[PDB]
Design a protein around this ligand. Structure first.
Ligand SMILES: *[C@@](C)(CO)[C@](*)(O)[C@H](Cc1ccccc1)NC(=O)[C@H](Cc1c[nH]c2ccccc12)NC(=O)[C@@H](C)NC(=O)CN1CCOCC1
Ligand SMILES: [Mg+2]
Lengths: 211, 231, 244, 235, 233, 222, 240, 195
């Protein structure tokens, strides 16, 4: 996998690939690596598919109970922390889970990185998975806070494409999300096969590849 | 009097008053009838409502595909005991690939109820149960009392005014036992039996509750317009 | 079952009082009077042993005054056996604090801990409370010299001068009359003994019927010394103050 | 003294029967079920004018499709609500669906008889559990400390219950609208309440399939009270 | 986790038209040492079931006791213990299979391979296998250990599929089993000449044969075999 | 050292139609190079119009199916005989699998049936509980042989329309039950040829609104 | 363990142990809470039967639960320490798991839950304590004032009093406190709090304690002289 | 994490801590603050295994903050350091020890003295004029041994600290992405925003 997420002027972008592996064998072409915890919270997935699904669906249980008791939506900071506390109970037991908790709350947009070690980092930009290095290259050279929603969506899309191309364990399809103060917004499933050729022609990039 | 404060105390005449008081809760409960032939076994229960706006409290509970019971008294205690039966029926299937014998189900209920009558702190169950079922030895009907006493019968009734239905079944014994391969006629005999325990009120569509199990018939409960046929 | 024989030690009366706490206080009111007086340059602890005998070995005896650590001491009123259970717990808490923070335990923190233990016996467990009232005399570098008291209810309060045990009503009136804020240890010693001499149920106050202790900065330079008075030393201070 | 789980000579549990007396002292709560939704309403009953009445929370959300009103020793209800909310969300975790109103009510009632010498006494509070699911539609349940629960078309609990229940007997029919039910709860609350009914000492709520469980604003309820006064003066 | 010490080798079995046959030799090996020569590894349960066990003998004796206790417990408060509510082969097997899988799940297995052979109430043949891992399977022919490699091929020539069962008589099936036991004696280094055989028929009931021997053995051709290649004398 | 796991071979295949679903699996059970049984059923009717198969280590597969069947039973008891939807069954199975996250059920699990809109549904699980709804899935020993064939012949991957030369794809026309069963049989016949653990028999369970139907076909026994 | 059910129902539907716990609160010294427009003030009675007291070290009646929330009480003193300790632990536990300090409403709900738990748990008696919990939520300038009691019920108050002769001071507050226009300043809020205590206290010397809590963790306790100035001004206006 | 330095001067304690956080082969963050305020005049920096560091730090923070509220009093740096040491010495013989090394910089308001305590994951406590954990000391201690005086000003302490970081940046193979510097003195804790 390759996942990324970054804060900007108009909220946060979240983009993920869709591949699943079983060694060299591609076990799934189109898996969903994003979880809609609530209308204002998202969760990316990288690592053991079972761990990612179980613990983030359990996080969603705990975030809903917060709303019922307090009559108020949970913050991104608090949600990310609940998850990191879960990881710390099974510390050393062999879980494999890397995730970004994306959302919009009272402090504005929020983005936290959480992993199986119990690490919890706040930041403007993150990328996880086997192909994160490729994604960072595109992101770091093109990122600005002053990005338009249209350009930001493309950047996250293009960054996954970069990783899908080079990384053998990344690809299949791209899933886009845009988080606003009115909630998150799904921006479709994009096949890499079709997207690659489209980007190659329009952008002029991937000159080395023959098409 | 002085010997009814708890279940751990015999009276001077050797009586257990807390158990007798638990038995009293059954008599206050709504009437329910049980009867069987050689092929089928039937439960008939008069459901009770709180008022006209309220629903009619359910009386019959399914335990397995081949076994179930009807209750009279404290409904929550029936839920606890029926849950136990569900687990025991289920343990028999999962471990031994064997449907639980109705007689053995009665023995398990007896032993569970007994522990509550000999220990300090707890209390006896405040409910009576009529268990019907079909196993490898044919159709069966059991009567459970929270004293622990379980009895295998051809037919019986428990609850308020249950003596009327019990007398009827005692007269009809030779007739209804012979109703083999005819579920509808066996239910008719059960509906006619429970009718001997009615006063003022009569059997309506949301009042009556019937259950049946048999040779090629899984334990199924009939409520609502499904029992209008028998009214 | 067993319920039949349960006294129910942790319940309220209709008036909102704890029966056993009130009855434990009644027990303590028959115990030997203990007095604590706090001065600017130290603290005094005085206490009366209960109707002794000539054959009691006094110099090796201890029923009233106990040492919790080098900085803190207590005077006891009530069941001695109950008090020793609590005293040993308090000694351990002081050492736990010292091991953890590498500093001597503040007086109030020790007092609160013991008072919390007493409180527990009034709210849960179904056991009788400790029939003990303490006077805590201690020093730390935050508040300096401090006097506290705790009773079976687990409630504790701070004092300039205070008495527990028998005749506290009479004793407190006498202390309230003669006490002043600028008072010194030598004066406080005299006040404590004079108060016991007037409130005692005995015919006369003698050395063999007393336990006495001081906590002084009267130790060579910035440090604190505990002095548990010996029988001969109590006899001397009785002559000095003009009681015998 | 005597056991907590003791039967009386009549065959009733003493403690359960005594807890029912505590519920009779509680403030009134009314529920009415219709085909357009279920309405829940309560008497707040502030003990003093300085008490900020909007902090009195006697109507409570369990899930988006289930609401709850209470009467009696309301402090006892907090752990019941906590269990209900947990049960509702846990079932959503295990089965990826809403939980049935009856199943939720049954889960709450399982706590009721877990007392002895587990908790030391029964709950001193009754609950009106209202909700909607796809199988049985709009439902209203009355959950007692006996562990028993009855389904109701309409139900009143608390100090003015038998007077309100007699009124609900005459007024309820199967074709009631949501608006009609709202006014009917307000009407009966106004009848049994000691103090004069207004938007500050009484609260309304409802559960519909579309919008889910909603507690009504004081401004919204105030209009329904004014609409009630005018329609009673109309004849 | 353990290791097997005293062990029993192959158990073989097959279905025929009216019932099932099961057989096993009477040896208890201690590694390469043929230590115990009078061990019965077929254990009847009632008059309708025979349990054949291979592997660790101490664990076999434990299972033998569980079954003996199962019969005792079934008779408790059961007037129909010798009739309608008697133990069935399917009940006995599922019990053992539950125990075997639980033990492996605690990482403390019963180091055995078991075949439960019997006839049900309705006359149906029962033949199912279970081992130390809790793995279960059924087939017209079943065999453990070496029998799986050598006996099954011979027994499957008689009953290759389900439709061959009604065509197979008890005489043919017994003949095939006895031949398979001879082949195992030729080729299994931890086998013995002495064995036991049990037949459970739906008409004639349980026939338990003890002290059987492998006979009609071919050895004469050995006299002609000389050296390992070039040797003539 | 004791190894609590084993490999009983086998291969399973689930395909979702427009208003139906199939779950197929071979009937061969093996250890190492030996055949245990030529007919040992692997796909089960679990009730509520749901079919299930746990492929890999038979003992763990039987235990899981047994537990899920039990979970269906208790779902009826606890929720007034309500029908367990396929999506609810899938989520329940995830929790059954994750209960042993640190001592897993060594099986690949597939279930099939109809969703609440009457459309065909297939769900796929890994041994530790990750699941997903899929149109097509092969699991087990010969999964890597069969899946590419299904990408090509079910989702028309790498297939384009003649004359356009790669510009226009083959349109995703739906498949009938008769067409699906052909692809299932050809998948297992091909898998039997090149995989030693696959053979003997093929059992298919078809699910429609009318119920669960079975079909059996012979395979090569070598 | 000791499992005896001490808090149980009576034939008339009362839990006497919970009601007798309220009688212990009635015996306790008077405590009062008044919230202004931009502050909350907590007033507390000190009974003058105890002189020769060391006021430096004697447990103060108002306790900080966190930097932004305070708790005063009426009833058994020893019992109150247990609630305060639990509350303080929960406050740090909330900051640690959720990364925000507790809201006043949440802290109250927790303390009330503890009190409730002790009314239906075996082997324990109810807390003989009612509390006033006041403060300001993080990044919020709206004042908060809550009350709890042994039964476990809690509610929000514009102004409230508990303890002995609380009936009298509540009478005073009900006629003197206007909701439409609450004490606009700190002075007006403190003045009204001292006035209310002067209906009951006896002497206005060392018998009145005042603690002012303002937004953004601004908590201070007034001294004897500062309070004495309020006492002087009130009575001089009264002589008319 | 990687590098944490500490120096005690005349009237303050200065803690410098690296900003880098690395997962696998990628640097995830270059602005991470490896420190927690335990009390107004006590700061603790930390370094060790991933996750354990923050957990332990926040757990210590919660305990000291609880003590402060209960007693309405700030514990001395010495008292806090002893509490921390005990928690680590308790931890080392646990089932799964917390793999965290810390520096505790505090200003004792009673004695009017700055204090620096170095504690490793075993519970090995030492009071020092300057300290470090891991490999940091190998490069920096020679400079500190040479240039350090006890009467140094805060500004001189920062200049000597710059020299230490420059040496680390020259001779360490790892890029630690600079340091966040914080000063602890009588007025409390503040961060040097330009370094
Ligand atoms: C890259 C593809 C890395 O290989 C991603 O991280 C991807 C993330 C992901 C997240 C959520 C759902 C699906 C996928 N990870 C995997 O695909 C993951 C990689 C993997 C394999 N073994 C691992 C061991 C430890 C950590 C990661 C490992 N693969 C899986 O989890 C595989 C084993 N499971 C499946 O593919 C099975 N399920 C896929 C979804 O459909 C149901 C079956
Ligand atoms: Mg093959």
């Amino acid at each position: 996998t390759t996942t990324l997420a970054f804060k900007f002027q108009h909220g946060v972008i979240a983009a993920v690939d869709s591949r699943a592996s079983a060694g060299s064998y591609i076990s799934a072409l189109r898996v969903n690596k994003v979880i809609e915890i609530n209308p204002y919270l998202l969760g990316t997935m990288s690592g053991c598919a079972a761990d990612c699904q179980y613990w983030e669906r359990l996080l969603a249980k705990e975030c809903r109970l917060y709303y019922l008791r307090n009559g108020e939506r949970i913050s991104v900071s608090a949600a990310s922390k609940l998850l990191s506390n879960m990881m710390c109970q099974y510390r050393g037991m062999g879980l494999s889970m890397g995730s970004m908790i994306c959302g919009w709350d009272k402090k504005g947009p929020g983005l936290y990185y959480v992993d199986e070690h119990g690490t919890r980092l706040s930041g403007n930009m993150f990328s996880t998975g086997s192909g994160n290095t490729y994604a960072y290259g595109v992101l770091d050279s093109n990122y600005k806070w002053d990005l338009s929603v249209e350009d930001a969506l493309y950047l996250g899309k293009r960054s996954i494409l970069a990783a899908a191309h080079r990384d053998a364990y990344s690809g299949g399809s791209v899933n886009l999300y845009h988080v606003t103060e009115d909630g998150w917004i799904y921006h479709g499933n994009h096949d890499v096969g079709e997207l690659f050729w489209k980007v190659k022609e329009e952008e002029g990039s991937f000159n080395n590849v023959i098409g | 009097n002085n010997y009814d404060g708890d279940t751990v105390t015999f009276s001077p005449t050797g009586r257990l008053f807390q158990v007798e008081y638990a038995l009293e809760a059954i008599k206050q409960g709504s009437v329910t009838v049980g009867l069987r032939s050689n092929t089928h076994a039937v439960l008939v229960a008069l459901k009770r409502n709180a008022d006209e706006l309220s629903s009619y409290q359910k009386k019959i509970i399914k335990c397995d595909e081949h076994m179930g019971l009807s209750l009279a008294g404290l409904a929550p205690d029936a839920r606890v005991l029926s849950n136990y039966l569900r687990q025991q029926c289920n343990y028999s299937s999962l471990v031994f690939n064997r449907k639980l014998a109705v007689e053995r189900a009665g023995h398990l209920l007896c032993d569970k109820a007994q522990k509550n009558t000999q220990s300090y702190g707890g209390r006896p169950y405040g409910v009576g149960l009529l268990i019907i079922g079909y196993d490898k030895s044919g159709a069966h009907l059991l009567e459970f009392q929270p004293s622990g006493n379980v009895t295998e019968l051809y037919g019986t009734a428990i609850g308020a005014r249950s003596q009327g239905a019990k007398t009827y079944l005692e007269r009809t014994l030779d007739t209804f036992i012979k109703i083999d391969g005819n579920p509808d006629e066996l239910i008719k005999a059960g509906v006619e039996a429970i009718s001997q325990s009615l006063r003022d009120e009569s059997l309506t569509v949301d009042n009556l509750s019937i259950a049946i199990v048999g040779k090629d018939t899984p334990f199924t409960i009939y409520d609502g317009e499904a029992v209008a046929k028998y009214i | 079952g067993s319920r039949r024989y349960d006294s129910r030690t942790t319940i309220f009366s209709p008036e909102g009082r704890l029966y056993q706490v009130e009855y434990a206080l009644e027990s303590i009111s028959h115990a030997g009077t203990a007095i604590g007086i706090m001065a600017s340059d130290g603290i005094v602890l005085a206490a009366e042993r209960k109707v002794t005998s000539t054959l009691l070995e006094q110099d090796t005896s201890t029923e009233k005054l106990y040492k919790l650590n080098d900085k803190i001491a207590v005077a006891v009123a009530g069941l001695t056996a109950d008090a020793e259970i609590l005293i040993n717990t308090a000694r351990i808490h002081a050492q736990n604090y010292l091991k953890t923070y590498n500093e001597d335990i503040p007086v109030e923190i020790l007092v609160r801990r013991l008072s919390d233990i007493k409180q527990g016996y009034t709210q849960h467990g179904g056991l009788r409370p400790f029939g003990v009232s303490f006077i805590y005399a201690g020093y730390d570098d935050r508040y300096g010299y401090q006097l506290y008291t705790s009773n079976p209810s687990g409630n504790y309060t701070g004092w300039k001068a205070i008495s527990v045990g028998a005749n506290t009503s009479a004793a407190q009136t006498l202390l309230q009359m003669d006490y002043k804020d600028d008072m010194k240890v030598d004066d406080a010693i005299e006040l404590a003994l004079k108060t016991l001499s007037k409130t005692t149920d005995s015919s006369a106050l003698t050395y063999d019927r007393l336990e006495f202790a001081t906590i002084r900065k009267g130790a060579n330079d910035g440090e604190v010394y505990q002095k548990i008075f010996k029988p001969q030393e109590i006899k001397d201070i009785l002559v000095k103050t003009g009681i015998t | 003294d005597r056991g907590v789980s003791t039967f009386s000579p009549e065959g009733r549990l003493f403690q359960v029967e005594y807890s029912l007396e505590a519920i009779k002292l509680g403030s009134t709560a009314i529920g009415i079920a219709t085909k357009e939704g279920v309405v829940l309403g309560v008497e707040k009953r502030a003990t003093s004018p300085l008490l900020e009445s909007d902090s009195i929370e006697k109507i409570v959300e369990i899930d988006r499709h289930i609401g709850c009103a209470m009467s009696g020793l309301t402090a006892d209800a907090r752990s019941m609500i906590e269990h209900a909310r947990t049960a509702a969300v846990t079932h959503n975790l295990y089965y990826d669906e809403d939980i049935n109103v009856e199943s939720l009510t049954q889960s709450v009632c399982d706590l009721a008889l877990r007392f002895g010498e587990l908790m030391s006494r029964p709950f001193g509070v009754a609950l009106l559990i209202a909700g909607h699911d796809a199988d049985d539609g709009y439902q209203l349940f009355h959950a007692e400390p006996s562990g028993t629960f009855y389904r109701y078309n309409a139900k009143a609990i608390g100090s003015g219950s038998e007077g309100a229940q007699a009124e609900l007997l005459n007024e309820w029919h199967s074709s009631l609208t949501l608006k009609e039910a709202e006014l009917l709860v307000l009407k009966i609350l106004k009848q049994v309440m000691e103090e004069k009914l207004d938007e500050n000492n009484a609260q309304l709520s409802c559960i519909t399939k579309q919008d889910g469980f909603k507690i009504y604003d004081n401004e919204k309820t105030a209009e329904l009270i004014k609409e009630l006064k005018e329609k009673e003066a109309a004849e | 986790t353990q290791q097997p010490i005293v062990t029993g080798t192959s158990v073989i079995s097959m279905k025929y038209d009216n019932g099932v046959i099961i057989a096993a030799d009477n040896l208890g090996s201690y590694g390469s040492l043929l230590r115990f020569n009078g061990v019965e590894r077929l254990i009847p349960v009632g008059d309708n079931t025979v349990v054949g066990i291979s592997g660790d003998i101490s664990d076999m004796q434990h299972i033998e006791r569980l079954l003996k206790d199962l019969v005792t417990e079934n008779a408790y408060d059961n007037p129909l213990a010798d009739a309608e509510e008697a133990l069935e082969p399917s009940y006995i097997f599922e019990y053992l299979a539950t125990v075997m899988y639980q033990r492996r799940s605690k990482m403390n297995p019963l180091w055995n391979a078991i075949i439960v052979a019997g006839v049900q109430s309705n006359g149906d043949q029962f033949l199912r296998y279970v081992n130390l891992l809790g793995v279960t399977y059924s087939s017209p022919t079943l065999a453990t250990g070496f029998g799986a490699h050598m006996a099954n091929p011979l027994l499957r020539k008689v009953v290759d599929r389900e439709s061959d069962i009604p065509k197979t008589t008890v005489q043919v099936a017994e003949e095939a089993i006895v031949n398979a036991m001879r082949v195992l004696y030729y080729r299994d280094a931890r086998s013995s000449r002495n064995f036991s055989l049990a037949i459970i028929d739906k008409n004639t009931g349980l026939t338990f044969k003890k002290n059987l021997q492998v006979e009609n053995m071919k050895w004469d051709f050995a006299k002609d075999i000389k050296g390992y290649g070039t040797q003539k004398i | 050292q004791f190894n609590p796991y084993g490999d009983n071979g086998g291969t399973i295949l689930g395909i979702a139609g427009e208003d139906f679903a199939v779950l197929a699996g071979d009937t061969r059970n093996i250890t190492d190079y030996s055949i245990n049984s030529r007919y040992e059923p692997k796909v089960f009717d679990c009730g509520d119009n749901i079919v299930m198969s746990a492929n890999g280590f038979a003992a763990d597969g039987d235990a899981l199916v047994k537990r899920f069947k039990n979970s269906v039973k208790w779902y009826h008891f606890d929720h007034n005989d309500k029908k367990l939807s396929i999506n609810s069954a899938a989520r329940n199975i995830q929790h059954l699998l994750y209960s042993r996250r640190f001592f897993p059920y060594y099986v690949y699990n597939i279930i099939a049936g109809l969703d609440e809109d009457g459309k065909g549904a297939v769900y796929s699980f890994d041994p530790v509980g990750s699941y997903q709804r899929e149109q097509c899935r092969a699991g087990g020993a010969a999964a890597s042989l069969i899946m590419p064939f299904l990408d090509n012949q079910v989702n028309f991957k790498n297939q384009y329309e003649p004359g356009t030369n790669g510009k226009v794809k083959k349109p995703l026309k739906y498949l009938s039950v008769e067409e699906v069963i052909k692809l299932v049989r050809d998948s297992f016949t091909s898998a039997t040829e090149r995989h030693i653990q696959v053979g003997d028999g093929l059992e298919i369970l078809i699910v429609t609104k009318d119920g669960v139907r079975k079909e059996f076909y012979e395979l090569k026994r070598d | 363990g000791y499992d005896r059910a001490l808090s149980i129902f009576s034939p008339d539907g009362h839990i006497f142990q919970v009601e007798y716990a309220l009688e212990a609160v009635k015996r306790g010294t008077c405590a009062v809470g008044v919230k202004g427009k931009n502050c909350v003030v907590l007033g507390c009675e000190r009974r003058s039967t105890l002189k020769l007291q060391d006021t430096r070290i004697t447990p103060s009646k108002v306790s900080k639960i966190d930097s932004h929330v305070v708790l005063s009480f009426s009833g058994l003193n020893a019992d109150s320490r247990i609630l305060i300790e639990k509350a303080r632990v929960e406050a740090q536990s909330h900051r640690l798991t959720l990364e925000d300090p507790v809201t006043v409403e949440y802290l109250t709900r927790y303390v009330a839950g503890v009190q409730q738990r002790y009314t239906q748990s075996g082997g324990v008696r109810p807390f003989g304590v009612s509390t006033l919990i006041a403060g300001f939520d993080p990044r919020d300038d709206e004042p908060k004032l809550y009350q709890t009691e042994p039964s476990g019920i809690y509610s929000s108050w514009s102004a409230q009093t508990i303890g002995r002769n609380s009936k009298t001071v509540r009478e005073f507050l009900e006629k003197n406190y206007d909701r439409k226009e609450p004490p606009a300043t700190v002075e007006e809020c403190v003045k009204l709090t001292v006035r209310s205590l002067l209906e009951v206290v006896q002497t206005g010397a060392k018998n009145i304690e005042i603690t002012v809590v303002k937004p953004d963790s601004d908590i201070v306790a007034l001294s004897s002289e500062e309070i004495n100035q309020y006492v002087t001004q009130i009575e001089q206006e009264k002589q008319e | 994490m990687d590098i944490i330095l500490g120096i005690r001067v005349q009237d303050s304690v200065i803690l410098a801590s690296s900003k880098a956080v690395t997962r696998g082969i990628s640097v995830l963050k270059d602005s991470d603050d490896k420190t927690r305020q335990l009390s107004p005049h006590t700061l603790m920096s930390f370094a060790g295994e991933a996750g354990d560091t923050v957990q332990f730090a926040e757990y210590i923070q919660a305990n000291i903050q609880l003590y402060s509220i209960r007693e309405d009093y700030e514990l001395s740096p010495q008292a806090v350091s002893s509490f921390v040491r005990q928690e680590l010495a308790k931890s080392i013989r646990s089932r799964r020890p917390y793999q965290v090394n810390v520096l505790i910089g505090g200003y004792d308001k009673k004695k009017n003295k700055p204090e620096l305590y170095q504690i490793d994951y075993l519970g090995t406590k030492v009071e020092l004029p300057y300290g470090a954990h891991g490999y940091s000391g190998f490069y920096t201690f020679s400079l500190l041994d040479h240039h350090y005086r006890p009467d140094m000003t805060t500004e001189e302490g920062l200049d000597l600290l710059k020299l230490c970081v420059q040496e680390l940046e020259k001779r360490m193979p790892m890029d630690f992405k600079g340091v966040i510097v914080k000063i602890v003195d009588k007025d409390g804790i503040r961060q040097v925003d330009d370094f």
